[PDB]
Symmetry: C3
């Protein structure tokens, strides 16, 4: 475009789309690790509950 403002807004939209995709990917990764943490903590509580006298 011959319009500087139009080129800038196009750049902003593209940069925003890419960043959003990356942020969602990272959020899902965090949720996966969060689940791993919860599962391992439950494992510890189960081992404690199943201890022999």
């Amino acid at each position: 475009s011959s319009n500087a403002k139009i080129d800038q807004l196009s750049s902003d939209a593209q940069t925003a789309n890419a960043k959003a995709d990356q942020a969602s990917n990272d959020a899902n990764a965090a949720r996966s690790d969060a689940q791993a943490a919860k599962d391992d903590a439950a494992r510890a509580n189960q081992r404690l509950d199943n201890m022999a006298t």
Copy 2:
């Protein structure tokens, strides 16, 4: 609008905003979920700490 280029820009802007809102919600929920996981791990160690 009959300006084709302006229409494409409108579409790109709308998609970008929609995705940013989607990612903002995802990130907010994930931070909260991570705190819950931190609390769960802390509670497991607490049970080990308080056992006689």
Copy 3:
């Protein structure tokens, strides 16, 4: 710009980019906290291994 549509698009594009930055920072914080939670759950199981 005397063109209202162009101004509105310029604003919306900048706002989307700012919101994406916010989401990036929050996602990064969540990954860090989740990792710390994983490490602490591992600490609990290690303590049990030594009993």
